[PDB]
């Protein structure tokens, strides 16, 4: 309750920084998240201490499969398309082709779209 807890407390700049600092690795295993009813792909920024939408720029399905792998869905992958961001976000995570830690902070997305990653075909019943 001064920084980020591991259930050990961590400085939020060491949360999601690529180096596993909690003994249970809690600081490095929950760094990718889907946001909102549109599955806006988000990555936690250690520097900005915030969750940020991944830009659709140069994002392919293997990066989604990897984010899906990093979220516990393993080889489950359903959809990764670009969508307008409804997460109310101002900073975004763009890919430096040269999951998390493979992105960098940008305030725009050249595609104008964020990644909507659907790791599993779920949430559908008999009635649309």
């Amino acid at each position: 309750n001064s920084g980020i807890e591991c259930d050990t407390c961590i400085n939020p700049s060491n949360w999601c920084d690529g180096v596993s600092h909690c003994p249970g690795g809690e600081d490095e295993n929950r760094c990718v998240r889907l946001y909102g009813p549109n599955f806006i792909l988000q990555v936690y920024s250690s520097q900005r201490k915030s969750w940020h939408p991944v830009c659709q720029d140069d994002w392919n399905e293997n990066y989604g499969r990897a984010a899906c792998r990093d979220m516990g869905y393993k080889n489950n992958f359903y959809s990764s398309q670009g969508i307008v961001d409804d997460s109310g976000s101002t900073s975004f995570m763009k890919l430096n082709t040269s999951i998390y830690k493979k992105l960098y902070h940008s305030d725009a997305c050249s595609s104008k779209a964020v990644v909507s990653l659907r790791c599993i075909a779920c949430g559908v019943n008999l009635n649309d």
């Binding site: 259930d7 809690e26 295993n29 929950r30 998240r33 889907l34 946001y35 909102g36 009813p37 549109n38 599955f39 806006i40 988000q42 969750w51 792998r69 990093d70 979220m71 516990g72 869905y73 393993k74 489950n76 997460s87 599993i120 075909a121 779920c122 949430g123 559908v124 019943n125 008999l126 009635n127 649309d128």
Partner: protein, 242 residues
């Protein structure tokens, strides 16, 4: 499920009957081909070991859950901070040895994502083979009922549950009663529709009586537990990767 209706094939393709000793004990929500969200009170000792548990998916009727249609549970994971007494963090995870074959009768529910912006009184649905009346017996047919979310501030009123609803708990149903979850819906889905997607908003945890006025259903807040769920699923994927 009190106040509800017989569920149709494929209406709740995530709903699973979890069995111990050839009888339904709890419900579950398929979130992945091998992972099932249930309640932690369901798998309290002595049912903490996966061997007691068999899962039945896509079968609406308990009598149609035959020897050979069950999916043996391989791993039971109770929430680490589950309290048997307050029933805070009443969420558990059941892995299946055999992955479930997804169809229109068996399908996963979507784990809730941060920022669902759900309504304070969001129309949700509760399914299960639990009692159709309080103190009643396990239902034969899978039942489901429309329930509305009750904001925790309203549910923590002295006239409802008196500060017993933790942040890891969400309330759903009707303050008038009549429509609630009951014995045997435990661990079952509290699911809502949003963006033409069904979202596992809660797992059936507890409540005083069934369908009693000012005594609604209390569900484990799956949103609060998503990180734990993602961590436990990823760790299993890493461990069996070898």
């Amino acid at each position: 499920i009190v106040g509800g209706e017989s569920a149709l094939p494929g209406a709740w393709p995530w709903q699973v009957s979890l069995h111990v000793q050839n009888v339904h004990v709890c419900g579950g929500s398929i979130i992945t081909p091998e992972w099932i969200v249930t309640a932690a009170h369901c798998v309290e000792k002595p049912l903490n070991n996966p061997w007691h548990w068999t899962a039945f998916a896509g079968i609406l009727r308990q009598s149609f859950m035959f020897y050979g249609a069950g999916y043996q549970v391989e791993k039971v994971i109770s929430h680490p901070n589950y309290d048997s007494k307050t029933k805070n963090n009443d969420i558990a995870l059941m892995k299946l040895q055999k992955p479930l074959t997804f169809n229109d009768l068996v399908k996963p529910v979507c784990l809730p994502n941060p920022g669902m912006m759900l309504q304070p009184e969001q129309l949700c649905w509760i399914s299960g083979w639990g009692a159709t009346e309080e103190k009643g017996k396990t239902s034969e047919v899978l039942n489901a009922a429309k329930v509305l979310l009750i904001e925790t501030q309203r549910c923590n009123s002295r006239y409802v549950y008196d500060n017993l609803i933790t942040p890891a708990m969400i309330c759903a149903g009707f303050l008038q009663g009549n429509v609630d979850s009951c014995q045997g819906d435990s661990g079952g889905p509290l699911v809502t529709s949003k963006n033409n997607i069904w979202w596992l908003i809660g797992d059936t945890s507890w409540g005083s009586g069934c369908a009693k006025a000012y005594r609604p259903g209390v569900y484990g807040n799956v949103m609060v537990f998503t990180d734990w769920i993602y961590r436990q699923m990823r760790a299993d994927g890493e461990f069996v990767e070898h």
